[PDB]
Amino acid sequence: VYSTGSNVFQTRAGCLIGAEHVNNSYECDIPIGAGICASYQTSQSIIAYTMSLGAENSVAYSNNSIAIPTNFTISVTTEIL
């Protein structure tokens, strides 16, 4: 409720104080908005970051390539309503 002149960060949501901007892209912990999420990590302080949406992967397409599995797994999940 009282200011700090140290480290402001002007995002599209508004002005953030008390956090450090991070050049890396991580998963969203708590939502601020406009792609920007924050967490307490490393010394350790609170950081705000652009979300990393998922691990990048490119499947090797061809016109003569088929992928077939050989092994399987029974897995059980829970769901609550």
Residues at the contact surface with other proteins, assessed by CB under 8 A: 12-13, 31, 33-35, 51, 53-81
Say which DSSP state 6 is in: S
Name the region of 38 (left: φ>0; alpha: ψ -120 to 50; beta: rest): beta
Nearest to 35 by CA among 21, 60, 53, 16: 53
Q: Assess 23 for contact with ligand NAG (CB under 6 A).
A: no
Q: Assess 67 for contact with ligand NAG (CB under 6 A).
A: yes
The residue count for binding ligand NAG (CB under 6 A) is 5
In the complex with other proteins, the residue whose CB is nearer, 23 or 58, is: 58
